[PDB]
Every structure is written in C-alpha cells, then in structure tokens.
C-alpha cells in the first residue's frame with residue numbers, strides 16, 4: 579500500500595559521495611516499480627550494485643543501470659531481457675524524475691535515468707516510475723561529473739543499494 583523507497587549509495591572513483599533515495603510509484607506503475615525495486619535489492623541474483631552512471635549530461639539526466647555491458651547497450655529486467663511499456667500516466671515534470679531508458683517501444687530492461695531538468699519530450703515514450711525523495715543534492719553533485727556528450731570525468735558508481743523503510 580505504501581510506495582516503496584530504495585536507496586543508492588553513490589561513489590566517485592570509489593570515494594563515497596552520498597545517498598540518493600527514491601520513491602517508486604508502485605501505486606501507478608507496479609510492474610516497472612517492482613523491477614527497479616528488485617534490481618536495487620539484488621534479490622533476483624543480479625542488479626544495480628556496483629554498476630555505474632555511464633552517461634551523465636548536465637542539465638538533462640544521469641543514466642545508469644547497465645549492469646551487463648556497462649555502457650548503455652545492456653541490462654536486463656527481472657522479467658526477461660525486456661518488458662513492455664507499462665503505462666505513461668506519469669510525466670517528465672522536472673528534476674528528480676526517475677524514468678526507464680529504452681531502445682524503442684516495449685524495450686525496458688534495467689537501464690534508467692534520473693532527470694535533472696524537465697524532459698517533456700520524453701512523455702509517452704519513456705515510462706516514469708519514481709522520483710528522488712532525498713539526495714537531490716547528491717544527484718546534482720553527480721551531474722557535475724558529466725559532460726555534454728555524456729562521458730563522465732570520474733567513475734560514478736552505485737556502491738551500494740537496497741530498500742529502505
């Protein structure tokens with residue numbers, strides 16, 4: 579009944595930076611929220627721990643979740659390699675939005691991005707399923723290690739992750 583909360587503990591070239599937590603909108607997008615929640619706990623035997631934010635573009639987004647190819651070409655969901663676009667109820671309203679990366683319709687895997695700007699042109703194309711709850715400052719810090727082309731100047735990792743409450 580209560581939306582779950584997950585955390586990532588972010589490191590920058592292995593140095594602790596801080597914690598970002600997310601509310602997952604399981605009330606709106608249960609299937610997509612469950613995927614992210616289980617990948618954050620690692621309870622299916624794989625997931626986000628130790629993965630990186632391989633693409634960070636300041637004033638746009640931080641993308642991560644590619645734990646199989648580490649570069650934006652990989653990842654898998656808890657349902658199989660890909661799963662459908664659950665719905666597009668929630669929109670890309672501003673910084674902090676948590677949304678699924680994809681390579682076309684119905685190609686959700688594990689990769690996700692945290693918005694650092696409003697990205698309304700993604701509405702109805704990427705599934706929005708959560709939002710930063712605490713540590714938007716940490717995301718802003720992360721974002722400073724990006725670049726226009728998305729390459730990061732330091733390795734931004736999810737040193738630890740899991741479920742809170």
Ligand SMILES: Nc1ncccc1Cl
Pocket residue numbers: 658660661662684685686
């Ligand atoms: N292509 C697919 N096949 C089976 C289940 C879900 C998807 Cl997206």
Ligand SMILES: Nc1ncccc1Cl
Pocket residue numbers: 650651652653679680681685686687688689
């Ligand atoms: N395999 C992928 N999964 C999610 C986003 C983008 C790609 Cl190429």
